[PDB]
Ligand binder design. Structure first.
Ligand SMILES: OC[C@H]1O[C@@H](O[C@H]2[C@H](O)[C@@H](O)[C@H](O)O[C@@H]2CO)[C@H](O)[C@@H](O)[C@H]1O
Ligand SMILES: OC[C@H]1O[C@@H](O[C@H]2[C@H](O)[C@@H](O)[C@H](O)O[C@@H]2CO)[C@H](O)[C@@H](O)[C@H]1O
Lengths: 134, 134
């Protein structure tokens, strides 16, 4: 959206993508998108502090050919505005696995059946400080 | 670019960019470009193992409106095909400072007078393993 945008990422199944960034002090939410391009996201990772009617909830969704799928909300919320947060992501043909700052990890279905992830983008509330490929 | 491409970097003067990657085992050379966009580069970092008459020489240049500037060549070459390569680049108003693995540093004039670096791209011979911003 307004943050870092990376293409030709070439992330393959099993590889661990580590993303560390600064959550804006006045952030009401932040976004980290992963997929083929801006209209095809295998993972729209959206922690919401107070936004879109939700409070302290991580909302995940997929975007296929521009269409948003069914959202999934997570069980925990290890985030806070104006702080550094790191997330670790891996995937296989069936699911993406996301590990959070608290070490908690959950899965989100790989609805685009991606065998490679080439696009990543952060919005204006998540300033990426480091990206690593394991 | 062939390799990783990142936009919206918004790297300001005084900020440092750290890039670590793996050089293709059969690479004749590899490239790391920095600038405003693909046609306006404040730094074309091109270590050449065997290309264009160069043998193990770091060639740097600027690109203005798609036109290559006057090349600069360094006295050391701490790189090798099939091995990891890490460089640290600091952006400043007058010059960019490049720090190599060995600790060797050199400067390259900010010919385009860029006030920020928003574009980064590695070519097909440089596989980025991690990038740290500021
Ligand atoms: O699904 C991701 C998508 O959600 C939009 O907001 C939704 C909100 O999540 C939902 O609970 C509500 O019922 O409808 C809203 C509008 O469709 C966000 O606006 C969009 O940016 C994405 O985050
Ligand atoms: O200047 C960077 C640019 O150089 C091109 O090759 C040059 C070569 O370095 C020079 O010695 C010769 O006189 O002209 C060639 C063509 O301009 C590379 O081909 C290009 O990829 C960049 O590396």
């Amino acid at each position: 959206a307004c943050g870092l945008v990376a293409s030709n990422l070439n992330l393959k199944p099993g590889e661990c993508l580590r993303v560390r960034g600064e959550v804006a002090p006045d952030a009401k939410s932040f976004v980290l998108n992963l997929g083929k391009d801006s209209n095809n996201l295998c993972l729209h990772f959206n922690p919401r502090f107070n936004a879109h009617g939700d409070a302290n909830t991580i909302v995940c969704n997929s975007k296929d050919g521009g269409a948003w799928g069914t959202e999934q909300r997570e069980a925990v919320f290890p985030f806070q505005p104006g702080s550094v947060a790191e997330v670790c992501i891996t995937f296989d043909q069936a699911n993406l696995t996301v590990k959070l700052p608290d070490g908690y990890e959950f899965k989100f279905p790989n609805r685009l059946n991606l065998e490679a992830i080439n696009y990543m983008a952060a919005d204006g509330d998540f300033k990426i400080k480091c990206v690593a490929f394991d």
